[PDB]
Design an enzyme around this catalytic site. Sequence first.
Site, PDB file in Angstrom:
ATOM      1  N   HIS A 218     -34.197  10.602   6.390  1.00 45.70           N
ATOM      2  CA  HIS A 218     -35.116   9.633   6.962  1.00 45.70           C
ATOM      3  C   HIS A 218     -35.710   8.730   5.888  1.00 45.70           C
ATOM      4  CE1 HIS A 218     -38.111   8.223   9.893  1.00 45.70           C
ATOM      5  NE2 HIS A 218     -39.123   8.514   9.066  1.00 45.70           N
TER       6      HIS A 218
ATOM      7  N   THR B 297       0.166  -6.763   1.610  1.00 44.05           N
ATOM      8  CA  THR B 297      -0.769  -7.444   2.516  1.00 44.05           C
ATOM      9  C   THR B 297      -2.160  -7.113   2.141  1.00 44.05           C
ATOM     10  OG1 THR B 297       0.915  -7.521   4.209  1.00 44.05           O
ATOM     11  CG2 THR B 297      -1.423  -7.593   4.951  1.00 44.05           C
ATOM     12  N   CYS B 298      -2.501  -5.845   1.878  1.00 41.93           N
ATOM     13  CA  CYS B 298      -3.881  -5.405   1.628  1.00 41.93           C
ATOM     14  C   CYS B 298      -4.502  -6.253   0.502  1.00 41.93           C
ATOM     15  CB  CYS B 298      -4.012  -3.918   1.384  1.00 41.93           C
ATOM     16  SG  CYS B 298      -5.247  -3.153   0.309  1.00 41.93           S
TER      17      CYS B 298
ATOM     18  N   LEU C 289      -1.920   0.737  11.904  1.00 42.18           N
ATOM     19  CA  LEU C 289      -1.664  -0.315  10.902  1.00 42.18           C
ATOM     20  C   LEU C 289      -2.876  -0.516   9.981  1.00 42.18           C
ATOM     21  CD1 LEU C 289       0.400  -0.916  13.339  1.00 42.18           C
ATOM     22  CD2 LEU C 289       0.503  -3.234  12.414  1.00 42.18           C
TER      23      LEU C 289
ATOM     24  N   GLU D 137      10.153  -5.540  -4.999  1.00 42.10           N
ATOM     25  CA  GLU D 137       9.102  -6.415  -4.435  1.00 42.10           C
ATOM     26  C   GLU D 137       9.569  -7.860  -4.515  1.00 42.10           C
ATOM     27  OE1 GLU D 137       6.111  -6.080  -2.612  1.00 42.10           O
ATOM     28  OE2 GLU D 137       6.520  -8.245  -2.553  1.00 42.10           O
TER      29      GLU D 137
ATOM     30  N   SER E 216       0.800  -1.234   0.000  1.00 43.98           N
ATOM     31  CA  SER E 216       0.000   0.000   0.000  1.00 43.98           C
ATOM     32  C   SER E 216       0.810   1.249   0.000  1.00 43.98           C
ATOM     33  CB  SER E 216      -0.952  -0.053   1.243  1.00 43.98           C
ATOM     34  OG  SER E 216      -1.816  -1.190   1.151  1.00 43.98           O
TER      35      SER E 216
ATOM     36  N   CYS F 201      -7.029  -6.635   3.629  1.00 43.60           N
ATOM     37  CA  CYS F 201      -8.269  -5.879   3.387  1.00 43.60           C
ATOM     38  C   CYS F 201      -9.148  -6.512   2.355  1.00 43.60           C
ATOM     39  CB  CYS F 201      -7.931  -4.424   2.923  1.00 43.60           C
ATOM     40  SG  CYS F 201      -6.491  -3.669   3.637  1.00 43.60           S
TER      41      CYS F 201
ATOM     42  N   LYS G 170     -10.273 -10.284   2.859  1.00 44.40           N
ATOM     43  CA  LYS G 170     -11.103 -10.221   4.059  1.00 44.40           C
ATOM     44  C   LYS G 170     -12.490  -9.681   3.687  1.00 44.40           C
ATOM     45  CE  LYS G 170     -11.826  -6.719   6.163  1.00 44.40           C
ATOM     46  NZ  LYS G 170     -10.814  -6.230   7.136  1.00 44.40           N
TER      47      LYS G 170
ATOM     48  N   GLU H 170     -12.894 -10.153  13.389  1.00 44.43           N
ATOM     49  CA  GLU H 170     -13.364 -10.341  12.027  1.00 44.43           C
ATOM     50  C   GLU H 170     -13.319 -11.793  11.593  1.00 44.43           C
ATOM     51  OE1 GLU H 170     -12.399  -5.826  10.222  1.00 44.43           O
ATOM     52  OE2 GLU H 170     -11.140  -7.564   9.580  1.00 44.43           O
TER      53      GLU H 170
ATOM     54  N   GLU I  19     -29.288   9.206  10.498  1.00 39.88           N
ATOM     55  CA  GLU I  19     -29.936  10.375  11.059  1.00 39.88           C
ATOM     56  C   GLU I  19     -29.849  10.428  12.552  1.00 39.88           C
ATOM     57  OE1 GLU I  19     -34.264  10.610  10.811  1.00 39.88           O
ATOM     58  OE2 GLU I  19     -34.381   8.457  10.251  1.00 39.88           O
TER      59      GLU I  19
ATOM     60  N   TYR J 148      -8.949  -6.469  16.154  1.00 36.62           N
ATOM     61  CA  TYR J 148      -9.969  -6.448  15.068  1.00 36.62           C
ATOM     62  C   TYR J 148      -9.791  -7.683  14.195  1.00 36.62           C
ATOM     63  CZ  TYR J 148      -7.150  -4.793  11.132  1.00 36.62           C
ATOM     64  OH  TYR J 148      -6.282  -4.689  10.142  1.00 36.62           O
TER      65      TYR J 148
END
EC number: 1.8.1.7
Lengths: 462, 462
Positions: free
Chosen positions: A451, A41-42, A321, A34, A14, A47, A50, A185, A456, A181
């Site tokens: 609404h 990772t993303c 992170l 690379e 990223s 991300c 997932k 998840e 709201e 998290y």
Amino acid sequence: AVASYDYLVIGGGSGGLASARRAAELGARAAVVESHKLGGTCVNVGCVPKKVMWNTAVHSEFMHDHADYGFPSCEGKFNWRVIKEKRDAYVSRLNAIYQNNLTKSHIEIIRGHAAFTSDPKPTIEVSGKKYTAPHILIATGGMPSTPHESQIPGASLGITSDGFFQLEELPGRSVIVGAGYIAVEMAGILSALGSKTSLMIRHDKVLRSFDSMISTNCTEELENAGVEVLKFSQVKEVKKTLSGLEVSMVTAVPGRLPVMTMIPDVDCLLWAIGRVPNTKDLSLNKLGIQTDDKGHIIVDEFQNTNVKGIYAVGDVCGKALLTPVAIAAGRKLAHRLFEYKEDSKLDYNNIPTVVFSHPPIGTVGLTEDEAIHKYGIENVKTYSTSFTPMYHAVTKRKTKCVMKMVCANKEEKVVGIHMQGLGCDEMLQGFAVAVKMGATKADFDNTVAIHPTSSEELVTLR
Amino acid sequence: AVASYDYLVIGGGSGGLASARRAAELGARAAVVESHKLGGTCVNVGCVPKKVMWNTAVHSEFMHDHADYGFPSCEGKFNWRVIKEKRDAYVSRLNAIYQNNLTKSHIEIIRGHAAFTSDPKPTIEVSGKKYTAPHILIATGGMPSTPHESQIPGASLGITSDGFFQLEELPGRSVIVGAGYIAVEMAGILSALGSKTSLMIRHDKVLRSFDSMISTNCTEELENAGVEVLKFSQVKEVKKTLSGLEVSMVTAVPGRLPVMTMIPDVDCLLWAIGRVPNTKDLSLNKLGIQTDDKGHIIVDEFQNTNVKGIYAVGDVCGKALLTPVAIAAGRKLAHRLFEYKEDSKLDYNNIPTVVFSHPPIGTVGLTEDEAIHKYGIENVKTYSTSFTPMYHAVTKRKTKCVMKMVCANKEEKVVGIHMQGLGCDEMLQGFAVAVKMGATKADFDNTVAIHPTSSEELVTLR
Ligand SMILES: Cc1cc2nc3c(=O)[nH]c(=O)nc-3n(C[C@H](O)[C@H](O)[C@H](O)COP(=O)(O)OP(=O)(O)OC[C@H]3O[C@@H](n4cnc5c(N)ncnc54)[C@H](O)[C@@H]3O)c2cc1C
Ligand SMILES: Cc1cc2nc3c(=O)[nH]c(=O)nc-3n(C[C@H](O)[C@H](O)[C@H](O)COP(=O)(O)OP(=O)(O)OC[C@H]3O[C@@H](n4cnc5c(N)ncnc54)[C@H](O)[C@@H]3O)c2cc1C
Ligand SMILES: NC(=O)C1=CN([C@@H]2O[C@H](COP(=O)(O)OP(=O)(O)OC[C@H]3O[C@@H](n4cnc5c(N)ncnc54)[C@H](OP(=O)(O)O)[C@@H]3O)[C@@H](O)[C@H]2O)C=CC1
Ligand SMILES: NC(=O)C1=CN([C@@H]2O[C@H](COP(=O)(O)OP(=O)(O)OC[C@H]3O[C@@H](n4cnc5c(N)ncnc54)[C@H](OP(=O)(O)O)[C@@H]3O)[C@@H](O)[C@H]2O)C=CC1
Ligand SMILES: N[C@@H](CCC(=O)N[C@@H](CSSC[C@H](NC(=O)CC[C@H](N)C(=O)O)C(=O)NCC(=O)O)C(=O)NCC(=O)O)C(=O)O
Ligand SMILES: N[C@@H](CCC(=O)N[C@@H](CSSC[C@H](NC(=O)CC[C@H](N)C(=O)O)C(=O)NCC(=O)O)C(=O)NCC(=O)O)C(=O)O
């Protein structure tokens, strides 16, 4: 011989991708190193896959409410392989897109593992070839943490989030260890898709660094959804059995005596206990680049290391992170270096977060306790609500929506917003813009409601 | 004899309820007159039952993507009666809640139809009893418009949105006439739930008062979803047949000749062509209260009529026909009258709207064309994107997300935001707070994104 560039970026995830692309827009002659797959990772193990699996887990709940909404139910089973194949294909599409993004920008792709050399002028080597630049960005990310065998014999029989994305079948019985998290998840996805799932946590609640309201509510919703939350519990040992793994657990609830429990017939044991920075084989010592005891690269507010001409951004630095943070820090650095904007840097305050629980969580700014510490108890006022979203007006299954607004000083500056509920994943971004602008409660209450929505409720608190 | 109050409110819908409750909080001795059901249009035949039916129509699309997400499909039919009964029960629960809200606030409920008397001091009569106050609010709402028989013979064979909520079965074949948000919403619900549906519009696109991007995209998504959009088309006559109604249509496309087409075997013809204010039997003439030619009560910026001590809010005034607008105007009026805040009034600029299409639409502020008119073409810049939400990365069915940001002057003040896409219903509220605060594009771009979401695309436009 040594090839020279304006900008050398170590890692094509990223932060590295974003920083290199912005530098190239400003005219820099850039290269990205690379060792594995572009997108980091993303894209590959984070991300993106997932979120695909979270969307899948939402399909499991539409299935449970279908009869309530007038349809005859669906009564057949999930096929993990179907979505695994589709998910993998999407990741492959993204790998090809990010390769093209670099090529279209005339950014060289160097494939292999980089390490620094002992040349006094900062230089890296990749597959026995040397590269140098006056500006070198370390953007190498991190990796999942696993316990040491010396500490938890048999820990290596478990998997991490990386192994989660290699699973080819739904585990029948899953035990997720951890309370952040990722643990939340992964437990919620596995349970929604039909795994008999436990989440083993060291204290009474998950997400304890989040606002107390979120920590409480998230724990309650996990239990309501069928995840077994094993409180005050830790793994002592793991053994291979004929039928999967046996997990030896110690439970030590305050006010009670400690107890050992065996958990038999576990198919998937997933460690979700933290992340370690990816710096062990960079040869940072050859240039004296400063790290903490955990291997994170130390930086100042401008992403400078302790060595002139070397920078670091993203997960390798251990702070906030998230993909958008790596990206924003990377882009702000590119403008500093290649547009000469000396004050260009990322503000790490008021970064918004979503946790893809069931229902999702959104938060930005200070918890109520952080605000009391900073401003004083007499100078903080909270407003909150709890309600059942109208989606559930006609269903037997229920989820709640909880919202908390934290206000500081006479003007009631909105210094934190915290919520869990249907829609909260898409609701938060705009409120984060208002908080970053210094919105007061009057600014929220002066905005006409939409609404019927959940959103709201945040502009009608009293 | 005549009973006196501090505040008399004619109509127990959104605006009347909100205004009376706020006045009572300030100490006013208040009464609400209601001839039918508390909660008005919103609760009984509007926002609330519409939203239940929209959630139902979303269940029809989860059903189409279930196999793509790894589940074996559902292959059986929708049962309208199931959800109708549940919807009606929810409305009944809300009627009881709003009755209690008034009673708990010590607000008298006068059941019956009010009309003004000729008493020089403003006085109403209800069921032969007289009531007076120094402050009388008219909050009587509106009703659907239907064509006159003299204009469209057989028009009375059609229904409106009111009759939609009385339907006990799904119509096999539906023709919706009109091109505003109600027409759009009803067509999308009926088609998603399996009616063979046409939407008959006078021009080429729906929602023509919305930003041009939304008008275009909404029309395209309707067609993509299977709604037959009958362009440049109007009803000339309706007849009862053995098999439902026959609708005689004239189509007159620019560049072509006009053509008459019969549409046979129509089960439901729904007029969604406008709203008329509910003022015909109020005896407004007895006090000389000013109306336009359509019967709307004329007001100033403070909701004053032309007669001292008489006010009007909400749909009866014909401006911004939304529940939150009636509520906000009603509450601001209560603070003016009973907290003596002479500058308390509703700002009708930057009111946000959602249209519950498939996918939903959100808008706040000026269309691009309105901004060009106000600021000058050289002083407006737009930023936009179109993408496929990641939900659809693995599905054969597709919807798009389109977003437009309208910016004015050198500072790029954000004067309009317009979008259609998954999540846009819950995404808009926070952005509306930022726009009301005078956010600039820099304010949006300084806010860190939330990934992966659709909402992040609004803070990463370039
Ligand atoms: C399961 C999981 C779920 C997540 N969910 C989210 C989410 O929903 N939202 C969110 O914002 N964040 C989420 N994150 C966090 C997000 O993925 C990371 O914050 C982000 O990827 C970090 O980017 P980065 O550039 O720092 O590192 P990375 O993306 O990890 O990229 C580092 C790159 O460096 C390469 N590399 C490392 N060392 C070398 C070397 N010496 N030579 C060459 N190449 C090298 C690696 O192969 C890799 O491609 C999630 C993470 C995980 C693990
Ligand atoms: C199909 C449909 C969908 C809609 N969807 C939405 C949506 O999603 N979001 C949104 O914000 N808006 C929506 N609206 C608009 C919203 O319903 C109205 O803007 C809102 O109800 C107007 O409130 P009001 O107080 O002006 O009038 P109303 O709620 O119409 O209340 C007027 C009340 O006055 C009573 N009454 C009238 N005359 C008398 C009299 N002389 N004596 C006694 N009582 C009397 C009526 O019986 C009624 O209860 C929708 C409307 C419709 C029709
Ligand atoms: N309020 C906000 O805005 C917050 C946002 N976030 C964001 O989320 C990112 C990730 O944070 P988070 O999910 O908290 O990350 P973590 O990787 O720190 O979560 C792992 C958690 O599991 C527990 N754990 C640690 N070691 C062990 C072990 N050996 N055995 C068992 N459990 C263990 C700890 O919780 P415990 O102590 O309960 O056992 C720990 O917090 C942050 O960098 C930030 O970007 C995070 C926190 C707050
Ligand atoms: N940009 C924004 O913020 C906007 C917000 N809104 C909000 O939505 C509310 C309702 O607006 P909207 O949905 O436009 O309402 P309308 O009730 O005006 O929509 C009905 C539409 O149908 C068409 N129509 C009218 N008469 C006939 C007829 N005799 N035969 C056939 N078609 C006919 C017209 O469109 P056509 O001329 O295409 O035939 C008309 O606009 C507004 O009061 C406002 O609160 C509305 C517009 C813009
Ligand atoms: N909005 C959430 C939660 C569901 C919800 O709003 N349910 C309530 C009935 S909404 S219809 C009547 C309407 N109310 C509003 O427009 C909301 C006003 C808002 N609370 C505010 O303070 O501005 C209305 O006529 N209000 C007039 C008045 O408020 O005086 C409800 O009653 N829930 C209580 C229950 O126990 O069910 C969502 O859409 O999910
Ligand atoms: N967000 C929407 C749309 C889906 C989407 O974002 N798809 C793209 C791949 S996202 S993963 C890689 C990550 N990208 C981001 O974090 C978004 C950055 C944002 N565009 C920005 O400008 O800040 C990343 O590593 N980016 C580094 C870089 O951007 O240089 C995608 O590629 N779509 C193109 C396609 O054709 O599929 C949603 O979630 O629905």
